[PDB]
Amino acid sequence: GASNSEKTALLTKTLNQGVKTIFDKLNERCIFYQAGFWIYEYCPGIEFVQFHGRVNTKTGEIVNRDESLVYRLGKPKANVEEREFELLYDDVGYYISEIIGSGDICDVTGAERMVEIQYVCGGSNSGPSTIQWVRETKICVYEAQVTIPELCNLELLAKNED
């Protein structure tokens, strides 16, 4: 390895403060994204599931819930401080990885119903929170990506058009 301490200081800080800032805007209400025919709704440390329906931006709520469309993508924890996260990066920028586990074992292969969530900045100076895309990556694993303005405050997560 050949790296200085400031480099690690900001890497570590970015992971820490990024998560705390995510939780601060998500605290407001849940987020939702219509991925073609399916809708994925993520809440501030409650659960992550996919249901059919529509949303009225005016009110910010779905048409009605759905007890027949049983789905589970993963269940987070209220004690976010205890949950460990990771700081990876891509050609676009750095991001925080949130693996939401506590899923059932998929009989297909014998793997957990967890999901990988990536927190990226949307290159926006303001706004609430929204998702970009969400889909199945493995037999029992899904991948989801959100774009929020507040992550751009962290130098490493700061998009070039913040």
N, CA and C of each residue as an Amber inpcrd file, in Angstrom:
protein
   486
   0.8350000  -1.2030000   0.0000000   0.0000000   0.0000000   0.0000000
   0.8660000   1.2470000   0.0000000   0.3500000   2.3550000  -0.5380000
   1.0570000   3.6300000  -0.6070000   0.0250000   4.7540000  -0.5220000
  -0.4830000   5.0230000   0.6810000  -1.4920000   6.0510000   0.9080000
  -1.2170000   6.8370000   2.1900000  -1.5820000   8.1240000   2.2010000
  -1.4030000   9.0220000   3.3470000  -2.6080000   8.9270000   4.3020000
  -2.4780000   9.5050000   5.5050000  -3.5250000   9.4720000   6.5230000
  -4.7440000  10.3400000   6.1890000  -4.5810000  11.5570000   5.6500000
  -5.7040000  12.4380000   5.2980000  -6.6790000  11.7090000   4.3750000
  -6.1380000  10.9390000   3.4300000  -6.8970000  10.1600000   2.4660000
  -7.8730000   9.2720000   3.2390000  -7.3640000   8.4660000   4.1730000
  -8.1650000   7.5740000   5.0100000  -9.1080000   8.3420000   5.9270000
  -8.6760000   9.4860000   6.4570000  -9.4830000  10.2970000   7.3460000
 -10.7660000  10.6980000   6.6240000 -10.6580000  11.2320000   5.4020000
 -11.8220000  11.6480000   4.6320000 -12.6280000  10.4410000   4.1810000
 -11.9860000   9.3120000   3.8650000 -12.7120000   8.1160000   3.4370000
 -13.6310000   7.6910000   4.5910000 -13.0470000   7.5040000   5.7710000
 -13.7530000   7.0990000   6.9760000 -14.8650000   8.0980000   7.3020000
 -14.5350000   9.3960000   7.3330000 -15.4980000  10.4270000   7.6460000
 -16.6800000  10.3700000   6.7020000 -16.4230000  10.3290000   5.3990000
 -17.4370000  10.2760000   4.3720000 -18.4210000   9.1300000   4.6530000
 -17.9460000   7.9300000   5.0100000 -18.8150000   6.7940000   5.3180000
 -19.7110000   7.1660000   6.5070000 -19.0950000   7.6510000   7.5890000
 -19.7730000   8.0240000   8.8290000 -20.8360000   9.0970000   8.6840000
 -20.4000000  10.2630000   8.2150000 -21.2640000  11.4080000   8.0800000
 -22.2720000  11.2090000   6.9550000 -21.9110000  10.4620000   5.9100000
 -22.8180000  10.2130000   4.8050000 -24.0400000   9.4680000   5.3310000
 -23.8460000   8.3530000   6.0500000 -24.9360000   7.5590000   6.6280000
 -25.7890000   8.4370000   7.5320000 -25.1740000   9.2000000   8.4310000
 -25.9800000  10.0330000   9.3310000 -26.8260000  11.0670000   8.6040000
 -26.3380000  11.5440000   7.4700000 -27.0320000  12.5280000   6.6620000
 -28.1400000  11.8410000   5.8600000 -27.9430000  10.5930000   5.4210000
 -28.9450000   9.8340000   4.6820000 -30.1630000   9.7160000   5.5900000
 -29.9190000   9.1970000   6.7920000 -30.9440000   8.9970000   7.8050000
 -31.6470000  10.3070000   8.1680000 -30.9740000  11.4550000   8.0770000
 -31.5880000  12.7420000   8.4000000 -32.6440000  13.1530000   7.3690000
 -32.4220000  12.9290000   6.0680000 -33.4260000  13.3060000   5.0650000
 -34.4600000  12.2120000   4.9160000 -34.0560000  10.9490000   5.0550000
 -35.0120000   9.8610000   4.9400000 -36.0080000   9.9280000   6.0840000
 -35.5840000  10.4380000   7.2440000 -36.4180000  10.5780000   8.4430000
 -37.7730000  11.2280000   8.1330000 -37.7940000  12.1680000   7.1880000
 -38.9700000  12.9060000   6.7580000 -40.1720000  12.0070000   6.4520000
 -40.0770000  11.1670000   5.4110000 -41.0810000  10.2180000   4.9150000
 -40.3720000   9.1290000   4.1040000 -41.1260000   8.1920000   3.5310000
 -40.5350000   7.1320000   2.7380000 -40.3840000   7.6430000   1.3040000
 -39.6260000   6.9110000   0.5000000 -39.3540000   7.2060000  -0.8980000
 -39.9630000   6.0780000  -1.7140000 -40.2540000   6.3450000  -2.9780000
 -40.8780000   5.3740000  -3.8580000 -40.5400000   5.6520000  -5.3120000
 -40.3260000   4.5850000  -6.0800000 -40.0000000   4.6630000  -7.5000000
 -40.7080000   3.5730000  -8.2880000 -41.4430000   3.9860000  -9.3240000
 -42.1620000   3.0870000 -10.2040000 -41.1710000   2.6090000 -11.2580000
 -40.7340000   1.3650000 -11.1330000 -39.8160000   0.6970000 -12.0270000
 -40.6840000  -0.0350000 -13.0590000 -41.1680000   0.6980000 -14.0590000
 -42.0250000   0.1700000 -15.1080000 -43.3820000  -0.2110000 -14.5230000
 -43.6330000  -1.5040000 -14.3120000 -44.8900000  -2.0270000 -13.7680000
 -44.8770000  -2.2090000 -12.2430000 -43.6970000  -2.3480000 -11.6370000
 -43.5520000  -2.5340000 -10.1950000 -43.1650000  -1.2230000  -9.5370000
 -43.4420000  -1.0800000  -8.2450000 -43.1100000   0.0990000  -7.4720000
 -42.3650000  -0.4370000  -6.2670000 -41.2640000   0.2170000  -5.9290000
 -40.3870000  -0.1270000  -4.8310000 -40.4690000   1.0350000  -3.8530000
 -40.8040000   0.7760000  -2.5840000 -40.9250000   1.8110000  -1.5580000
 -39.9650000   1.5310000  -0.4090000 -39.0560000   2.4730000  -0.1610000
 -38.0730000   2.3790000   0.9060000 -38.3850000   3.4030000   1.9920000
 -38.3960000   2.9480000   3.2400000 -38.6990000   3.7630000   4.4110000
 -37.4690000   4.0100000   5.2950000 -37.4440000   5.0750000   6.1240000
 -36.3340000   5.4200000   7.0200000 -36.0690000   4.3660000   8.1070000
 -35.4320000   3.2570000   7.7320000 -35.1000000   2.1500000   8.6100000
 -36.3420000   1.4270000   9.1230000 -37.1530000   0.8610000   8.2190000
 -38.3720000   0.1150000   8.5590000 -38.3290000  -1.2160000   7.8020000
 -38.5150000  -1.1700000   6.4800000 -38.5240000  -2.3080000   5.5650000
 -38.3910000  -1.8240000   4.1100000 -38.0700000  -2.7380000   3.1880000
 -37.9480000  -2.4810000   1.7500000 -38.7560000  -3.5770000   1.0670000
 -39.7850000  -3.1970000   0.3100000 -40.6700000  -4.1270000  -0.3900000
 -41.1000000  -3.5510000  -1.7530000 -41.6510000  -4.3900000  -2.6460000
 -42.1370000  -3.9930000  -3.9710000 -43.6320000  -4.3280000  -4.0760000
 -44.4730000  -3.3840000  -4.4920000 -45.9200000  -3.5460000  -4.6300000
 -46.4540000  -2.8820000  -5.9030000 -47.6700000  -3.2470000  -6.3260000
 -48.3180000  -2.6360000  -7.4860000 -49.1050000  -1.4200000  -6.9630000
 -49.4730000  -0.4640000  -7.8180000 -50.2170000   0.7250000  -7.4060000
 -49.6780000   1.9620000  -8.1100000 -49.9890000   3.1470000  -7.5750000
 -49.5670000   4.4630000  -8.0650000 -49.4440000   5.4050000  -6.8770000
 -48.8340000   6.5780000  -7.0540000 -48.6810000   7.5730000  -5.9970000
 -49.1970000   8.9130000  -6.5120000 -49.7230000   9.7340000  -5.6100000
 -50.2220000  11.0670000  -5.9150000 -49.1500000  11.9850000  -5.3610000
 -48.2900000  12.5990000  -6.1750000 -47.2400000  13.5010000  -5.6770000
 -47.8060000  14.6090000  -4.7900000 -49.0380000  15.0320000  -5.0870000
 -49.7640000  16.0660000  -4.3730000 -49.8130000  15.7670000  -2.8760000
 -50.1320000  14.5300000  -2.5180000 -50.2390000  14.0890000  -1.1340000
 -48.9670000  13.3860000  -0.6560000 -48.3170000  12.6720000  -1.5730000
 -47.0980000  11.9030000  -1.4010000 -47.3870000  10.4820000  -0.9170000
 -48.5960000   9.9560000  -1.1340000 -48.9970000   8.6160000  -0.6890000
 -49.5010000   7.7520000  -1.8420000 -49.3880000   6.4320000  -1.6650000
 -49.7940000   5.4150000  -2.6340000 -51.3330000   5.3840000  -2.7110000
 -51.8890000   4.7250000  -3.7270000 -53.3290000   4.5820000  -3.9140000
 -53.9020000   3.8400000  -2.7000000 -53.3740000   2.6490000  -2.3970000
 -53.7420000   1.7580000  -1.3010000 -52.6090000   0.7370000  -1.1500000
 -52.4590000   0.1100000   0.0210000 -51.4360000  -0.9190000   0.2540000
 -51.8920000  -2.2110000  -0.4530000 -51.0890000  -3.2780000  -0.4370000
 -51.4510000  -4.5340000  -1.0910000 -51.0330000  -5.7610000  -0.2840000
 -52.0100000  -6.3860000   0.3700000 -51.8190000  -7.5710000   1.1990000
 -51.6720000  -8.8570000   0.3770000 -52.1090000  -8.8640000  -0.8830000
 -52.0280000 -10.0390000  -1.7390000 -50.6350000 -10.1520000  -2.3630000
 -50.0590000  -9.0270000  -2.8000000 -48.7390000  -8.9240000  -3.4170000
 -47.6540000  -9.0030000  -2.3350000 -47.4300000 -10.1900000  -1.7740000
 -46.4370000 -10.4160000  -0.7310000 -45.0360000 -10.4170000  -1.3380000
 -44.1820000  -9.5010000  -0.8850000 -42.8000000  -9.3420000  -1.3030000
 -41.9890000  -8.8490000  -0.1060000 -40.7010000  -9.1790000  -0.0780000
 -39.7460000  -8.7940000   0.9500000 -38.4110000  -8.6360000   0.2410000
 -37.7120000  -7.5140000   0.4270000 -36.4020000  -7.2800000  -0.1940000
 -35.3210000  -7.2400000   0.8820000 -35.6810000  -6.9630000   2.1390000
 -34.7600000  -6.8990000   3.2690000 -35.3370000  -6.0190000   4.3740000
 -34.8690000  -6.2110000   5.6150000 -35.3060000  -5.4250000   6.7650000
 -34.1050000  -4.8150000   7.5020000 -34.0200000  -3.4780000   7.5590000
 -32.9710000  -2.7090000   8.2100000 -33.2090000  -2.7280000   9.7190000
 -32.4470000  -1.9230000  10.4620000 -32.5500000  -1.8000000  11.9070000
 -32.6520000  -0.3310000  12.2740000 -33.2890000  -0.0700000  13.4070000
 -33.4920000   1.2650000  13.9410000 -32.1870000   1.8180000  14.5150000
 -31.3260000   0.9270000  15.0030000 -30.0410000   1.2570000  15.6010000
 -28.9990000   1.3050000  14.4980000 -29.1610000   2.2550000  13.5880000
 -28.2720000   2.4890000  12.4590000 -26.8060000   2.5690000  12.8880000
 -26.5390000   3.0600000  14.0990000 -25.1910000   3.2220000  14.6340000
 -24.4590000   1.8920000  14.7460000 -25.2240000   0.8440000  15.0250000
 -24.7320000  -0.5080000  15.1840000 -24.5170000  -1.1720000  13.8240000
 -25.2780000  -0.7680000  12.8000000 -25.1190000  -1.3380000  11.4690000
 -23.8280000  -0.8110000  10.8500000 -23.0900000  -1.7030000  10.2080000
 -21.8520000  -1.4010000   9.5270000 -22.2090000  -1.2690000   8.0530000
 -21.5120000  -0.3520000   7.3980000 -21.6580000   0.0020000   5.9950000
 -20.2820000  -0.0450000   5.3340000 -20.2260000   0.1280000   4.0150000
 -18.9790000   0.1120000   3.2550000 -18.9350000   1.3200000   2.3300000
 -17.7300000   1.7670000   1.9740000 -17.5040000   2.9090000   1.1010000
 -16.7660000   2.4440000  -0.1460000 -17.4810000   2.2600000  -1.2480000
 -16.9250000   1.8410000  -2.5310000 -17.0050000   3.0580000  -3.4610000
 -16.5530000   2.9190000  -4.7050000 -16.6240000   3.9880000  -5.6830000
 -16.7580000   3.3810000  -7.0700000 -17.1700000   4.2040000  -8.0240000
 -17.3300000   3.8310000  -9.4170000 -16.8470000   4.9980000 -10.2750000
 -16.9450000   4.8710000 -11.5900000 -16.5020000   5.8670000 -12.5530000
 -17.2150000   7.2030000 -12.3530000 -18.3870000   7.1650000 -11.7220000
 -19.2410000   8.3050000 -11.4540000 -18.9000000   8.9720000 -10.1300000
 -18.5180000   8.1930000  -9.1250000 -18.1650000   8.7350000  -7.8340000
 -18.2270000   7.6980000  -6.7210000 -17.8930000   8.1180000  -5.5000000
 -17.9110000   7.2680000  -4.3130000 -19.3520000   7.1130000  -3.8350000
 -19.6410000   6.0290000  -3.1140000 -20.9720000   5.7430000  -2.6010000
 -20.9130000   4.8330000  -1.3780000 -21.9640000   4.8940000  -0.5610000
 -22.0970000   4.0860000   0.6480000 -22.9570000   2.8760000   0.2790000
 -22.5320000   1.6830000   0.6900000 -23.2100000   0.4200000   0.4560000
 -23.9450000   0.0280000   1.7330000 -25.2370000  -0.2500000   1.5960000
 -26.1330000  -0.6570000   2.6670000 -26.7330000  -2.0020000   2.2860000
 -26.2980000  -3.0700000   2.9510000 -26.8200000  -4.3970000   2.6870000
 -27.9460000  -4.5780000   3.6850000 -29.1630000  -4.7020000   3.1720000
 -30.3310000  -4.9070000   4.0020000 -30.6000000  -6.4030000   3.9310000
 -30.2970000  -7.0970000   5.0190000 -30.4690000  -8.5260000   5.1870000
 -31.7440000  -8.7750000   5.9710000 -31.7960000  -9.8960000   6.6870000
 -32.9510000 -10.2920000   7.4820000 -34.0810000 -10.6640000   6.5170000
 -33.7050000 -11.4780000   5.5330000 -34.5610000 -12.0010000   4.4970000
 -34.6030000 -13.5160000   4.6480000 -35.6500000 -14.1200000   4.1030000
 -35.8690000 -15.5590000   4.1300000 -34.9130000 -16.2190000   3.1390000
 -34.6520000 -17.5070000   3.3080000 -33.8050000 -18.2770000   2.4200000
 -34.6640000 -18.7170000   1.2320000 -34.1660000 -18.3950000   0.0500000
 -34.7340000 -18.6940000  -1.2460000 -34.4820000 -20.1650000  -1.5140000
 -35.5440000 -20.9650000  -1.5300000 -35.4920000 -22.4110000  -1.7580000
 -34.8110000 -22.7690000  -3.0680000 -34.8580000 -21.8730000  -4.0580000
 -34.2590000 -22.0480000  -5.3750000 -32.8130000 -22.5080000  -5.2550000
 -32.0320000 -21.7950000  -4.4440000 -30.6260000 -22.0890000  -4.2480000
 -30.1650000 -22.2930000  -2.8110000 -30.7850000 -21.6000000  -1.8600000
 -30.4300000 -21.6610000  -0.4540000 -29.7230000 -20.3680000  -0.0600000
 -30.1340000 -19.2190000  -0.6280000 -29.5350000 -17.9130000  -0.3560000
 -30.5330000 -16.9580000   0.2960000 -30.0670000 -15.9950000   1.0940000
 -30.9250000 -15.0250000   1.7810000 -31.4780000 -13.9500000   0.8420000
 -32.7030000 -13.5310000   1.1690000 -33.5830000 -12.5210000   0.5810000
 -33.1020000 -11.0950000   0.8630000 -31.7950000 -10.8920000   1.0230000
 -31.2230000  -9.5800000   1.2760000 -31.2000000  -8.7460000  -0.0210000
 -30.7470000  -7.4980000   0.0690000 -30.6460000  -6.5600000  -1.0410000
 -29.4470000  -5.6450000  -0.7930000 -28.8020000  -5.1900000  -1.8660000
 -27.6700000  -4.2790000  -1.8200000 -28.2240000  -2.9230000  -2.2450000
 -28.0860000  -1.9210000  -1.3900000 -28.5400000  -0.5730000  -1.6510000
 -27.3000000   0.3140000  -1.7330000 -27.1960000   1.1380000  -2.7690000
 -26.0800000   2.0480000  -2.9850000 -26.5820000   3.4820000  -2.8860000
 -25.9660000   4.2760000  -2.0160000 -26.3110000   5.6710000  -1.8140000
 -25.3640000   6.5550000  -2.6090000 -25.8880000   7.2330000  -3.6290000
 -25.1060000   8.1120000  -4.4810000 -25.7520000   9.5070000  -4.4620000
 -25.0090000  10.5420000  -4.8560000 -25.5560000  11.8920000  -4.8980000
 -26.1390000  12.0630000  -6.2990000 -27.2700000  12.7610000  -6.3980000
 -27.9650000  13.0080000  -7.6570000 -27.4500000  14.1970000  -8.4500000
 -26.4020000  14.8750000  -7.9760000 -25.8690000  16.0540000  -8.6560000
 -26.9740000  17.1060000  -8.6540000 -27.4420000  17.4240000  -7.4490000
 -28.5000000  18.3780000  -7.1980000 -28.1360000  19.1220000  -5.9150000
 -28.3220000  20.4410000  -5.8870000 -28.0170000  21.2420000  -4.7020000
 -29.1770000  21.1800000  -3.6900000 -30.3490000  20.6800000  -4.0900000
 -31.5020000  20.5880000  -3.2090000 -32.4750000  19.5070000  -3.6670000
 -33.4740000  19.2510000  -2.8260000 -34.5490000  18.2890000  -3.0090000
 -34.6540000  17.3090000  -1.8390000 -35.6860000  16.4490000  -1.8400000
 -35.9100000  15.4400000  -0.8180000 -35.0850000  14.1900000  -1.2010000
 -35.7000000  13.0470000  -1.5360000 -34.9700000  11.8340000  -1.9040000
 -35.7680000  10.9740000  -2.8900000 -35.0850000  10.3540000  -3.8600000
 -35.6810000   9.5120000  -4.8900000 -34.7060000   8.3920000  -5.2920000
 -35.2340000   7.3380000  -5.9120000 -34.5100000   6.1670000  -6.4110000
 -34.3130000   6.3440000  -7.9240000 -33.2680000   5.7230000  -8.4710000
 -32.9300000   5.7660000  -9.8880000 -33.4330000   4.5470000 -10.6470000
 -33.1790000   3.3540000 -10.1240000 -33.5630000   2.0820000 -10.7090000
 -33.4360000   1.0350000  -9.6080000 -34.1180000  -0.1040000  -9.7690000
 -34.1140000  -1.2120000  -8.8170000 -34.3960000  -2.5070000  -9.5950000
 -33.5780000  -3.5620000  -9.4340000 -33.7770000  -4.8460000 -10.1310000
 -33.0690000  -6.0080000  -9.4340000 -33.3970000  -7.2330000  -9.8320000
 -32.8400000  -8.4740000  -9.3070000 -31.4540000  -8.6570000  -9.9250000
 -30.4620000  -8.9750000  -9.1040000 -29.0740000  -9.1840000  -9.5190000
 -28.6780000 -10.6650000  -9.3870000 -29.2150000 -11.3760000  -8.3870000
 -28.9300000 -12.7900000  -8.1220000 -30.2310000 -13.5200000  -7.9050000
 -30.1470000 -14.7900000  -7.5560000 -31.3520000 -15.5990000  -7.3390000
 -32.2770000 -14.9850000  -6.2790000 -31.7070000 -14.5400000  -5.1590000
 -32.4420000 -13.9450000  -4.0450000 -31.8850000 -12.5680000  -3.6920000
 -31.1300000 -11.9390000  -4.5970000 -30.5380000 -10.6330000  -4.3020000
 -30.9970000  -9.6050000  -5.3120000 -31.2040000  -8.3880000  -4.8200000
 -31.6350000  -7.2380000  -5.5910000 -30.6120000  -6.1260000  -5.3740000
 -30.6160000  -5.1520000  -6.2710000 -29.7450000  -3.9850000  -6.2720000
 -30.6460000  -2.7690000  -6.5000000 -30.4450000  -1.7030000  -5.7160000
 -31.2000000  -0.4570000  -5.7570000 -30.2380000   0.7170000  -5.5630000
 -30.5050000   1.8460000  -6.2240000 -29.6540000   3.0250000  -6.1380000
 -30.4720000   4.2920000  -5.9200000 -30.1280000   5.1050000  -4.9110000
 -30.8430000   6.3570000  -4.6500000 -29.9340000   7.5320000  -4.9390000
 -30.5500000   8.6500000  -5.2940000 -29.8850000   9.8950000  -5.6110000
 -30.4650000  10.9710000  -4.7130000 -29.6140000  11.5070000  -3.8470000
 -29.9870000  12.5420000  -2.8940000 -29.0330000  13.7290000  -3.0170000
 -29.4700000  14.9540000  -2.6910000 -28.6390000  16.1410000  -2.7990000
 -27.6090000  16.2320000  -1.6770000 -28.0160000  15.9870000  -0.4300000
 -27.1530000  16.1010000   0.7380000 -25.8340000  15.3290000   0.6980000
 -25.7310000  14.2010000  -0.0190000 -24.4500000  13.4890000  -0.0470000
 -23.3880000  14.3420000  -0.7120000 -23.7660000  15.2230000  -1.6420000
 -22.8310000  16.0870000  -2.3340000 -22.0670000  17.0250000  -1.3960000
 -22.4820000  17.1340000  -0.1330000 -21.8200000  17.9590000   0.8630000
 -20.4680000  17.3170000   1.2060000 -20.3830000  15.9820000   1.1400000
 -19.1650000  15.2250000   1.4010000 -18.3410000  15.3220000   0.1270000
 -17.1260000  15.8480000   0.2280000 -16.1830000  16.0480000  -0.8720000
 -16.0310000  14.8170000  -1.7770000 -15.9460000  13.6140000  -1.2050000
 -15.7870000  12.3830000  -1.9830000 -17.0420000  11.9740000  -2.7430000
 -18.2180000  12.3160000  -2.2250000 -19.5110000  11.9880000  -2.8270000
 -20.0590000  13.1480000  -3.6690000 -19.3720000  14.2910000  -3.6470000
 -19.7090000  15.4980000  -4.3700000 -19.6160000  15.2120000  -5.8580000
 -20.7410000  15.3130000  -6.5610000 -20.7570000  15.0990000  -7.9960000
 -20.1940000  16.3520000  -8.6350000 -19.7730000  16.1990000  -9.8810000
 -19.1850000  17.2840000 -10.6450000 -20.1640000  18.4020000 -11.0120000
 -21.4670000  18.1820000 -10.8200000 -22.5350000  19.1350000 -11.1280000
 -23.4460000  19.3380000  -9.9050000 -22.8720000  19.2630000  -8.7020000
 -23.5560000  19.4640000  -7.4110000 -24.2190000  20.8390000  -7.4070000
